[PDB]
Spike glycoprotein (Horseshoe bat sarbecovirus), 676 residues
Amino acid sequence: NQNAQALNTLVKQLSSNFGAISSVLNDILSRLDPPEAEVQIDRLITGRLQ
Amino acid sequence: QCVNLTTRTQLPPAYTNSSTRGVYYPDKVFRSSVLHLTQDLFLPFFSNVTWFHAIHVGIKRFDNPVLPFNDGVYFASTEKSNIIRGWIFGTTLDSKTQSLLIVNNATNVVIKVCEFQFCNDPFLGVYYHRNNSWMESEFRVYSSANNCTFEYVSQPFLMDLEGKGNFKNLREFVFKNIDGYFKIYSKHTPINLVRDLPPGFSALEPLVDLPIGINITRFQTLLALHRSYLTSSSGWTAGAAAYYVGYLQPRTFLLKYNENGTITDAVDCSLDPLSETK
Amino acid sequence: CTLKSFTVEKGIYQTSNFRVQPTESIVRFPNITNLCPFGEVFNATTFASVYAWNRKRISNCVADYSVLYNSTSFSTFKCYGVSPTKLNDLCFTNVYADSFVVRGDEVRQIAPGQTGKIADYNYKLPDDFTGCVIAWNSNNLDSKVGGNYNYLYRLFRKSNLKPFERDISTEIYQAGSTPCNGVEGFNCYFPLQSYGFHPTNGVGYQPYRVVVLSFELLNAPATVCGPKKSTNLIKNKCVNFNFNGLTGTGVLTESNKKFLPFQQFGRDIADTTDAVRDPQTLEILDITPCSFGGVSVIT
Amino acid sequence: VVRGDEVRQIAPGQTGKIADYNYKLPDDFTGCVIAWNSNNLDSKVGGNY
Ligand SMILES: CCCCC/C=C\C/C=C\CCCCCCCC(=O)O
Ligand SMILES: CCCCC/C=C\C/C=C\CCCCCCCC(=O)O
Ligand SMILES: *[C@@H]1O[C@H](CO)[C@@H](O)[C@H](O)[C@H]1NC(C)=O
Ligand SMILES: *[C@@H]1O[C@H](CO)[C@@H](O)[C@H](O)[C@H]1NC(C)=O
Ligand SMILES: *[C@@H]1O[C@H](CO)[C@@H](O)[C@H](O)[C@H]1NC(C)=O
Ligand SMILES: *[C@@H]1O[C@H](CO)[C@@H](O)[C@H](O)[C@H]1NC(C)=O
Ligand SMILES: *[C@@H]1O[C@H](CO)[C@@H](O)[C@H](O)[C@H]1NC(C)=O
Ligand SMILES: *[C@@H]1O[C@H](CO)[C@@H](O)[C@H](O)[C@H]1NC(C)=O
Ligand SMILES: *[C@@H]1O[C@H](CO)[C@@H](O)[C@H](O)[C@H]1NC(C)=O
Ligand SMILES: *[C@@H]1O[C@H](CO)[C@@H](O)[C@H](O)[C@H]1NC(C)=O
Ligand SMILES: *[C@@H]1O[C@H](CO)[C@@H](O)[C@H](O)[C@H]1NC(C)=O
Ligand SMILES: *[C@@H]1O[C@H](CO)[C@@H](O)[C@H](O)[C@H]1NC(C)=O
Ligand SMILES: *[C@@H]1O[C@H](CO)[C@@H](O)[C@H](O)[C@H]1NC(C)=O
């Protein structure tokens, strides 16, 4: 149960935006130009790496 | 043209608790089989709710006062004769400012924003001709017209007017006025309870979002009275009607989404310790 | 490459998960043909005063502004929630158009988080704003030799204005503590003042026409869409789809679930769009990633 | 040489006729943009075309 819960919560962590405008990459890329969207992409990358 | 009605009995109203009412969809995104936690304006569980009623006899009364409007209210009307017609919203309702009027005459719902000049007792009449048929005369809610920036009238329809032993409609509404918009949520659940509020769970779906762009602090309700031959005091008897008013507060809820994609259960995060740990 | 070396010893060496290349791409937009009425809103002969701004709903449009490049030149065009370059590959939901007339140097106050008479007593924008603000000089049309006095603005109020609010009350403003009682006395002032426009005024006093558009981008079904041609739907293979501006990559398939009338697409626990509703055909489709399964190299 | 109010379009990530059909700057740009009025030199009474 501990292993299953750890994997489940790791999957669930993907639904939180680490200060970005949205929690998914597709919406950010569709709404913003590359040079501006790179900031939000970096924020999400850092959060998921942590 | 409107005249204040006389001969109404005086007594303070009663109080009731809405068990699990006032839950509505937070947005327009489909979800299923998930436990979504969101925070918004909501009606707290087991909150005090004033109970007004319109009934005939020395107990004849209408009870359509100017209730305050505090950052969104919860309205639930139950009846069987379509007595409840609509509401009016505004600050002072004395033609100095703009006010929103929502009402269906008998054949089409009318929404207007204008500098209306209301009177103290707004109502709509219904006439019961005995030889043959209810005509619904006496449209005297307000007294003057003005610039009337906003305007919307639906397509003509028809509806019954008598419908008279237990209530059968239980029509609920939710009003919110945020950032210049007037969101409205509605639901229609048939019931058969006699003279109370049926406890249960109901999820409300959005209906309309009007860009009214005005300031609202107070509101009323329009009632329809029917007189045929009973003698200002011309026998304005009311068949049967009651409605309940609650006030929204900023709370946190734990909505549950069904397999189909419907909200079936909610949990308050501030009701009691058990719900807090839930 | 994974080991970052040119020598590999024995082992199992679980490498990166395999992927599938999405060789094709589709675009799916609703059936909108008639162009948007740019002439009605931009080329209007008359414009309302700033305090009583006029709001107009726009729907069933093809938001192609390429026809405007020869008509009008805009001195200010700022977008907040969406990049200007990506304005052609999107579908908008609930656009609205607001228009009024202000002075030459008060255009800077039409922006979120700004102060001034315009941003306090006439027209306030929300802090969280998505849309664009367009203004252009109109000295040729809104000025006369004798002075144009048709435009009025509010000068006094008892409090600030909430976002997207209107107030047309003309009650006498009281500046002191003595009651005014309707009489325009010493401390009593008319709340709204008049503008003075002349053809020979300075550039900071020439009239400026302002058009503001507010919309929601992804949520809810959309009605105003840009100029992108729609292609045939492709099923059961990897494609760079584009459903009303939502660009991704996946494999489409039939879905048993049905959406409510006011819903467009759904999200899973990961908050990603797994199911969408096609705009051309009222159908439900499911999106799944093209890569699934691990691969390891024994050597 | 451009119109007076079109100097705003000379910037990365900008739209308009100048930044679509005439002259476009890259998204990753390093440098400076300089503009100044030249009405005294580039205008004539009969119209400069
Ligand atoms: C004489 C000032 C002494 C210093 C006072 C200190 C702080 C107050 C700050 C700003 C007030 C002056 C600027 C007013 C801007 C109004 C803008 C407008 O009208 O469009
Ligand atoms: C009447 C518009 C209704 C809303 C349409 C929705 C989205 C389209 C967005 C913007 C179009 C108007 C601005 C055009 C800018 C051109 C700039 C230039 O020429 O320098
Ligand atoms: C109703 O009452 C108000 C205040 O009591 C009064 O001003 C008004 O004139 C009354 N209505 C009529 C028709 O006289
Ligand atoms: C709330 O309801 C209770 C029970 O009916 C009552 O005793 C109390 O006075 C009510 N409070 C208010 C503010 O109405
Ligand atoms: C509110 O009313 C309901 C139904 O009558 C009841 O179950 C509940 O205990 C009441 N709550 C309070 C605090 O009186
Ligand atoms: C209600 O208003 C509509 C127009 O908005 C009108 O046609 C209708 O006649 C009115 N109702 C009655 C009973 O006259
Ligand atoms: C019913 O009769 C009255 C009186 O003759 C008449 O005014 C009314 O129009 C009639 N209504 C119908 C539905 O026949
Ligand atoms: C509303 O109408 C009055 C005339 O009754 C007029 O003086 C005023 O300017 C109008 N205001 C608007 C916003 O239309
Ligand atoms: C909800 O899901 C059940 C599961 O099969 C289904 O039988 C039912 O019809 C669904 N509800 C509606 C309103 O279709
Ligand atoms: C939309 O257009 C497509 C192609 O022109 C057509 O196949 C489809 O039937 C249209 N949709 C409707 C609702 O007419
Ligand atoms: C558009 O505006 C220009 C100048 O403002 C005018 O010359 C032209 O006639 C207008 N066209 C239409 C269709 O209104
Ligand atoms: C563009 O505008 C100029 C104004 O001088 C006019 O002569 C020309 O015909 C226009 N062309 C188009 C395609 O609108
Ligand atoms: C809305 O109206 C009330 C009147 O009850 C007033 O006190 C309040 O200041 C108004 N709102 C704003 C933002 O001025």
Residues B 105-106, 108, 110, 136, 153 surround 2-acetamido-2-deoxy-beta-D-glucopyranose (ligand 6) (CB under 6 Å).
